[PDB]
Design a binder for these strands. Structure first.
Lengths: 62, 50, 104, 149, 107, 124
RNA sequence: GUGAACAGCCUCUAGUUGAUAGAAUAAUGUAGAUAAGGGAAGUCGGCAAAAUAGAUCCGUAACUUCGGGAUAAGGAUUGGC
RNA sequence: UUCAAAUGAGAACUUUGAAGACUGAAGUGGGGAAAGGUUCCACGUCAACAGCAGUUGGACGUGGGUUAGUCGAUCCUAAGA
């Protein structure tokens, strides 16, 4: 259904922008049911959401 | 503006309380004339000008 | 004066599984160990050994655990066992290899 | 082989634009890993041995308790409410009988018809229209200061 | 009749003289139409991997000769159209030339 | 192509050819006369300070050494360092008489080969 | 980062993918360009169009409220290692 | 802009995933001042509107939410009344 709210809440609780949240299309029922900070923390501990850390910005040629 | 005076805030609070559609049970009376309230207002269309 | 540094890497789990060749790993480390520029010019200063479960390296010259990790992953990809062999560190200067969380 | 591998790597990299998922935290399946293990041609004997290890949640699917409550039947009745939670509804609580509730809903549906015909944005929008424009139905467009561009 | 016959496709045949802005969408439409004409079905689905391959070089720089395979699949139940169904899938090759259509046996 | 190339190599704007350059350089008596002109007014150099190799008038007196130290003049010198060749060489290569071409090359090497070096040494 | 630069150009953190679309590319425009040879010849009228254009060195007239004019004009050079 | 999946009677536009993109830090970001005044957010729902569709909304219906001995006013004064 709708997951933008969950994505925004997860981004806020993690501390990164809303574009840096990964979700599993295979497993969506749990994330749809989850709507609390404790729920997001427990699921990210479970590893259903990744941090997808910052893209590479090399300076070697510089 | 987060700096309104108390009377201004009271006016806005009364406007917010007023802002509602008609209760459904009104139409169940006898010899009724109210169809839809014409005093309903929304922020997009009408401005109360305080 | 100079203090030697020791690093131990344990490959017990995957080698006992049977998808690892510690002797070949030791041979590769001996052949391709690089110190100060060229490869093979080691001045009898850094030695390696294998016992069948743990690979231990003792270095007196310039060396780093990050560089050891880099060489380990380079050999991992050369043997084409990446995406299946996971590298981690048990504690300071001590590392181990393990599987991943397939859990299907 | 090397040309095929470099082509596949170039296809799969996509490192430039967004990101690359870390292999240490991605999830896989032994069903998928079996083909790669076979291609590498290692000892599958000490690999499938971990399959029976998964025999822990196999019995956990059974829980009992009316065979997990006897299918989803309370949801259908609990979702019939217009609003959830325990709070006073100035529309729902006004009328008790369901027949009169349906009557009121029908009355509202009918009543909105006139505004729908008038194409108003809703029961609240009442923006009227002026019959004529002072700035569009007067003046003489002579030389000099024009009425407008 | 579930069959699998890896074909070959050149984009230059059907992307010549088209707007730079819509190179990739034109490629997608031509690919689906080519699958339609060379199979004879009604429902065609593309592969995310093929989408990655076609867009990967660039929006206005799609490579000419790309290798693809087409799989027939029987449609699921309650499909009012037909059991016919085509699914595409990419596969990379060392050299674009030197290959022709080859049917691959089911395994 | 409608750009810098045509705008710089348009038919109006042409330069001398390496063949005539080689001819005048070889001619010892022409070396002095290429610069010892009586007077000129039309050209911007007023018939003074004309670099033969670059084939241009310097328009002043002190820019001569500047252009000589410049790399472009050295580039032209390096280009002139090559063998001149002519249409006869191309004709001989394209399935024609080779004895005459070989005799001409031998005579060139025996007579005018060091002649360019001697003229350059005498001039500078 | 490119450089004199808070110019423009590409990227990072962050944010967006919203503005009706699909099939073919005829004439008549919008904004741009390009054109062999002549080079302003008609055009009220060198007006939208082009030329030098950045930096370093040389030498810079008439006139003068001697403070400017002046980057006057022109010429030589511009890479990589 | 592209593809897949899911929801959904019904998907060029809803959600997620997979790609491509741009804004390029004197931003399409992060806060605010005037002004705006419940639009913030949650839940069920789409006849009326978002010139097109909408299974979506800054739309509809019901509710939740702003905590100051230290932040500003309240204290003082200027041109003024």
């Amino acid at each position: 259904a709708n997951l933008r709210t969950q994505k925004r809440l997860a981004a806020s609780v993690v501390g990164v922008g809303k574009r840096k949240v990964w979700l599993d299309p295979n497993e969506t029922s749990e994330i749809a049911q989850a709507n609390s900070r404790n729920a997001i923390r427990k699921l990210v501990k479970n590893g259903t959401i990744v941090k997808k850390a910052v893209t590479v910005h090399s300076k070697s040629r510089t | 503006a987060a700096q309104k005076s108390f009377r201004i805030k009271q006016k806005m609070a009364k406007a917010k309380k007023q802002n509602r559609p008609l209760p459904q049970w009104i139409r169940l009376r006898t010899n009724n004339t109210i169809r839809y309230n014409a005093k309903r207002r929304n922020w997009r269309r009408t401005k109360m000008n305080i | 004066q100079k203090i030697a540094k020791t690093f131990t890497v344990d490959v017990s789990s995957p080698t006992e599984n049977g998808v690892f060749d510690p002797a070949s790993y030791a041979k590769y480390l001996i052949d391709h160990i690089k110190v100060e520029g060229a490869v093979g010019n080691l001045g009898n200063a850094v030695t390696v050994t294998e016992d069948g479960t743990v690979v231990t390296v003792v270095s007196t010259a310039k060396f780093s655990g990050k560089y050891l990790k880099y060489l380990t992953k380079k050999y991992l990809k050369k043997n084409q066992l990446r995406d299946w062999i996971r590298f981690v560190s048990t504690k300071t200067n001590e590392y181990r290899l393990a599987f991943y969380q397939v859990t299907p | 082989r090397q040309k095929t591998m470099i082509a596949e790597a170039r296809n799969r990299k996509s490192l430039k634009n967004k990101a690359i998922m870390p292999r240490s935290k991605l999830t896989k399946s032994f069903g998928k890993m079996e083909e790669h293990m076979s291609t590498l041609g290692h000892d599958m004997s000490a690999l499938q041995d971990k399959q029976n290890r998964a025999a822990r949640k196999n019995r956990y699917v059974e829980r009992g308790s009316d065979v997990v409550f006897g299918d989803q039947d309370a949801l259908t009745a609990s979702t019939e409410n217009g609003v959830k939670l325990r709070q006073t509804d100035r529309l729902l609580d006004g009328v008790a009988d369901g027949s009169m509730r349906s009557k009121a809903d029908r009355m509202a549906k009918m009543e909105r018809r006139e505004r729908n015909r008038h194409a108003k944005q809703g029961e609240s929008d009442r923006h009227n229209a002026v019959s004529l424009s002072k700035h569009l139905f007067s003046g003489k467009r002579g030389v000099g200061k024009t009425d407008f561009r | 009749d579930v069959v699998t016959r890896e074909y070959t496709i050149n984009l230059h045949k059907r992307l010549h003289g088209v707007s730079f802005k819509k190179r990739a969408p034109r490629a997608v439409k031509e690919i689906k139409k080519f699958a339609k004409l060379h199979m004879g079905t009604d429902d065609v689905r593309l592969a995310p991997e093929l989408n990655q391959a076609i867009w990967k070089r660039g929006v206005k720089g799609v490579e000419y000769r790309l290798r693809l395979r087409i799989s027939r699949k029987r449609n699921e139940e309650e499909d009012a159209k037909n059991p016919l169904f085509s699914y595409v899938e990419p596969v990379l090759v060392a050299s674009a030339k030197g290959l022709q259509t080859v049917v691959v046996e089911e395994d | 192509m409608g750009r810098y190339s045509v705008k710089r190599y348009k038919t109006k704007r042409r330069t001398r050819d390496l063949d005539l350059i080689y001819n005048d350089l070889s001619t010892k008596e022409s070396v002095q006369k290429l610069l010892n002109q009586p007077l000129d007014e039309t050209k911007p150099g007023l018939g003074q300070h004309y670099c033969i190799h670059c084939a241009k008038y310097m328009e002043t007196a002190i820019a001569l050494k500047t252009h000589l130290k410049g790399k472009v003049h050295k580039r032209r010198v390096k280009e002139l360092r090559g063998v001149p060749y002519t249409q006869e060489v191309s004709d001989a290569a394209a399935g024609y008489n080779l004895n005459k071409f070989l005799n001409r090359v031998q005579e060139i090497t025996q007579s005018v080969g060091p002649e360019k070096e001697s003229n350059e040494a005498l001039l500078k």
